[PDB]
Symmetry: D2
C-alpha cells in the first residue's frame, strides 16, 4: 500500500579509496527526500550490492533507515543467488529497520521455476516484512514466469509485488490479470517506465531518479493521476538520460551524473570501472536536455 511513484535505487557513494562515504550517503538520502522522492531502495544493484560486504550492507541500510526517519518507505536489497545467503540478508534488512526487501531472481546458476519458488518461499518464511520480486532476465538470464509469480503471491501474504526489469511491457498486463490489481507492480526500467504504468504499473524503482528525483516523482505522479499528457512531456525530458546512464555498465554512469551535480564522487568497485570521456559527454548532453544543468 506504501509503494508507489518514484522509488530511487540508491547509489552507494564511495570515497577515494573505495570505502563507504557515510556523510555523502546520508546527505544524499536527505536530498532525495526533500526533493520529493516517494521511496528509497538502499543496497541494490545500483547501490553496488555485489561488491558490498555483509557488514556494509547492514550499515548502509541502518544509515538509510535512520536518515529517512519513516518519512518514506525503505525497500532494501537482500539479493543473492544462494537461498541461505538471501535468507540471511533479508533477515538483516528486517532487523536494520527496512520496510520491505527487494529480492532478485538468482543469477548465474540458472534455476528453474521450482528453484525460483523454493528460493522466494524460503525468504518469505524467514521474515515478517514484505517482499518485492526483482525479475531481471537481462542480468539473471532466467525469468520468473507469471504463473510462478502468482503462486508465490497467493501462498505468501508478505510477497506483495514485483520490480519488473524485463522492459517487456506486455508482462505488466499479464501480471495484473493473474496476480491481481492488488499486486504492486513497479517498473525496474526507466526506459519503458511510462508505458509500464499505462499497462497497470504504479511507479518505478528508478536509476535516473538518483539525479532527477523531482522530475521522476512528477512523471510518476502524473501517471498516478492519469495525466499522460504531462507524463509524456516529462518522459521526453528524461529519456536521453535514461538511456545514457546505461551506455556503460551501471552504476558508473549514474554515479558520474550524481558527481556532476556535486552529490558524490565518481569512484566505483571493480569490476565496475570509470566511464570513458565519450560516455561522459553523452551524459552531459542528456543532463542538459533534462534541465539539470
Amino acid at each position: 500500500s506504501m509503494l508507489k511513484g518514484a522509488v530511487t535505487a540508491l547509489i552507494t557513494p564511495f570515497d577515494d579509496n573505495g570505502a563507504i562515504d557515510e556523510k555523502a550517503f546520508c546527505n544524499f538520502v536527505e536530498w532525495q527526500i526533500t526533493q520529493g522522492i516517494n521511496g528509497v531502495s538502499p543496497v541494490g544493484t545500483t547501490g553496488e550490492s555485489p561488491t558490498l560486504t555483509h557488514e556494509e550492507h547492514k550499515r548502509i541500510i541502518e544509515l538509510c533507515v535512520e536518515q529517512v526517519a519513516k518519512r518514506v518507505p525503505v525497500v532494501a536489497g537482500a539479493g543473492s543467488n544462494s537461498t541461505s545467503e538471501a535468507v540471511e540478508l533479508a533477515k538483516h534488512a528486517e532487523k536494520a529497520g527496512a520496510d520491505a526487501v527487494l529480492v532478485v531472481t538468482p543469477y548465474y546458476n540458472r534455476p528453474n521455476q521450482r528453484g525460483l519458488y523454493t528460493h522466494f518461499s524460503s525468504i518469505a518464511k524467514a521474515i515478517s516484512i514484505p517482499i518485492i520480486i526483482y525479475n531481471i532476465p537481462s542480468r539473471s538470464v532466467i525469468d520468473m514466469a507469471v504463473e510462478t509469480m502468482r503462486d508465490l503471491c497467493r501462498d505468501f501474504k508478505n510477497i506483495i509485488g514485483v520490480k519488473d526489469a524485463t522492459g517487456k511491457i506486455e508482462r505488466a498486463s499479464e501480471q495484473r490479470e493473474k496476480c491481481g490489481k492488488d499486486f504492486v507492480q513497479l517498473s525496474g526500467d526507466d526506459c519503458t517506465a511510462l508505458g509500464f504504468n499505462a499497462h497497470g504499473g504504479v511507479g518505478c524503482i528508478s536509476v535516473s531518479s538518483n539525479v532527477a528525483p523531482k522530475l521522476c516523482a512528477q512523471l510518476h505522479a502524473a501517471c498516478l493521476c492519469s495525466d499522460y499528457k504531462t507524463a509524456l512531456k516529462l518522459n521526453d525530458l528524461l529519456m536521453p538520460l535514461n538511456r545514457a546512464v546505461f551506455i556503460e555498465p551501471s552504476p558508473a554512469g549514474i554515479k558520474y551524473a550524481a558527481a556532476k551535480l556535486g552529490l558524490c564522487g565518481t569512484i566505483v568497485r571493480s569490476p565496475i570501472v570509470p566511464l570513458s570521456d565519450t560516455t561522459k559527454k553523452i551524459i552531459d548532453e542528456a543532463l542538459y536536455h533534462a534541465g539539470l544543468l
Copy 2:
C-alpha cells in the same frame, strides 16, 4: 498524416481448397468499416503475403480499394527481401488505388543499414504515395536503426512513418525524439500497443482488430483523446486474446478467432498450419473474456 487509430492487418480468407474467398474478403472489409475501423492494411503478413502470388496480391488490393471507396485509408503490403520485387509490388499497389504501402525490412538476407537505406530509397523513388516502414526484428532478424529511419524520412517526403513491431516501447521515445513528432508511429504489436501510445504512438496496425475492430478502435481513440483509464480497461479485455493469437504461428490463431465469429473459414497456406486443440481452447476463453462471445 491523418493515418491514426486502429488499422487492421487484414486476414485473407481462403476457401476449402485454399483459393482466395473473394466474397468473404469483401464482406469482411465492409464489416470492418461499419464496425468503426480507422484504416485497413491488405496483403501484409497477417494476410499471408508470403504465400500469395503477385496476381493474388494485386487482386486483393484492387478488391480492398473498390470495397473501401476511400472511406478509410488502405495501406497495402508491398514487402519483399528483394528490392526490385518490393519496388514492383509497391508500383502495383499504387496503380490499384492504395493510399500508402507497408514495407517490411528485408528478411532472411540480413542487409546492413546501408542496404536498408538503398532498399527503402529505391522504393520511395519508384512511387508517389506514402511508405510506412515495418520494423520487425523478431521476423527479419535485422533492425532498422533509428538513424536510418530519420535519414530515410529526411531524404524522402513519401517515407512518413513506422509500423513498430519491436515490442520495445523505448523505441517509440527515441523515434519521436530523433525522427520528430511529425513522424507517424503505429504499433505493430497489440500486446504493447497501449504503452507504445503512451510513449508517443498514434495508433496500431493490429492483428486482434480483425475480430475486435470496435474495441480496438475504441482503445486507440481512448489513447488519442488521452483517456488512459478507459484505455487500460479496454486493454484488459483484449490482452488475453492479443497473446492467444500468437501462441501458434500467425495467422492460424487470428483466422480461427475469425471463424468462431463467422467472419471466415480457418484454412491457411503451408507452412502455416491448423491450430492444436489446446490453442483453440485458450482462444475460445480469451474471446469470452473480451465479450466477443456471449
Copy 3:
C-alpha cells in the same frame, strides 16, 4: 553417397547492370571443377537466390548442369517461405537436371515443427531426386528440431541429409545419433566445419570454396581420411578468410574476394551492397594469409 567433401555455395556473377553474367558463371563453374571441388550448389543464399527471378533461377541451374557434365553432383537451391513456391522451385531444379535440391527452413513466417514437416513432406512428394535440409536459425529464426529431421528422413526416402548452418557442433552428434550414421551431414558454416566433421560430418557446403576450391577440397579430404593434424593446419590457412567474408552481409564479401582473383566482378543485388574499404582490406589480408594472392 557422392555428397561429401567440399561443395561450393556458388556465387552468381552479375554484369555492371546487375544482369546475370552467364559466360562468367560457366567459366567459374569449370574452374571450380578443375580445381578439384567435390560438388556445386547453384542458386542458394550465396548465389543470391532471394533476388533472382524464377526464370533466372531455372537458367542458372540449367547452365550449371550443362557445364558440370555429371563430373560432380549439382545440389540446386529450391528454397522459399511458401510451400507452393518451394515445390515449384524443386520441380524446376529436377527438370533442369539437378542431382539434388537444397531447401531452407521457412524464413520470416516462423512455422512450428508441424508446419516444417508439412513444408518438407510436400516437396519430397513432388520430386524424385534427393533433398538436403538447410537448417539456419540465424536467418530463418526458427530451428528444425532433430526429432522433426528424424521424422522427415524416416517417412521420406528422398530426404537424405542436412546443410547444418547452426554453428552448434553438438547438433552433428544428435543428428548422427537419431537420424543415423547414414544421414548425410554437411556443415553450412566454414568457421566451425572442421569440428563439425569431427562430430560426424562428411563435408561442407561452403562459401569460402568459391575462392579457395582446392584448399577447401584438401581440408575436407583430410577430414574424410581422418587426418585431423593436416585438416587443422589447412584450417589455420582458411579461418581468417572464413570469418572475413562474413563481416558484411554475404555475398558482398565473397564476391569481392572472387573479383580480386579475376573470377568475376563485384556487383550484388540490393539490398546486398558494396563493401566498405575496411572490410576489403581485411579480406585482402585473409586472401594473402591463405596464399591466394
Copy 4:
C-alpha cells in the same frame, strides 16, 4: 603445461541435511584418480560454489589437495562477480595448495572489457599460481573478447589459458591464432569438446567426467594423439549423457547420475532442486547407452 586431457569439474557431495559429506568427497576424488582422470577442479560451478561459504570453499580445496597428493593438477574454483572477493578466494586456494585457479567472468553486474581486464589483473597480482579464464556467456551474459584474453596473457605470466564454455568452436581457432599455441585451451562444454579439440583444444574441464572419468579421459587422450576415429566412437557413447545432465539446472542432473553409480547422494542446495522423473528417466537411458549401467 601439465594441464591437458580430462579434468573433472568436481561435484560437492552433501549429506541429508545439505552439509558437506567429507568422506563421500574424499572417496570420490580417490576414485576419479584411480579411474585415470588427468586433473581435478574443486569448488567450481558444478561443485555448487555459489551456495558454499568461504569456510567450506577453503575446506573442500584442502581436502581435495590432500587427497590428490600431487598425482594430478588441482585447479581450484575462485570465481566471483566481486574483484576483491575473487582476490581473497584465489589467495585461500593458493594457500591451500591448489596448482591453479579457475576464475569465471563476473556475472550479473555485466562489466565491460576494461572491467574484465581490471578484475583479472588484480587477481593475477595477488597470487603466484596460474589462472585459467572461465568464459561462459550463457551464465555471465557478457563475453570476454579474444583481444582481452590476449592482453591479459601478454601482461601476466600467470594467466595461462581458458575454460571455454561458449560452445562456439570458432572461438578455439580465434584464441589459438591470437593468444598463442602456448595458450592453454580447455573446453568447458562436454557437448562440443570433441570438435573443440579438433580446432586446437587440449582437453576439457568436464561435468560428464564426474560419472565417466575413464571414458572421458580416453576420449581426450584419443584427441591428444590425433586418433579422432576412436574419439568419435567414445563421443557417441557420451553425448546423450552430456546433454541429459543439463536438461535441468546443474548439478542436479550430474549428481543424480552420480547417485545412480553409488558415488554420492542427490542432495543439492537451493535454488538448485531435485530432478523431475522425466529427466531421471532420460539420464538412466543415457547411462545405459554409455555402458555405465547394465
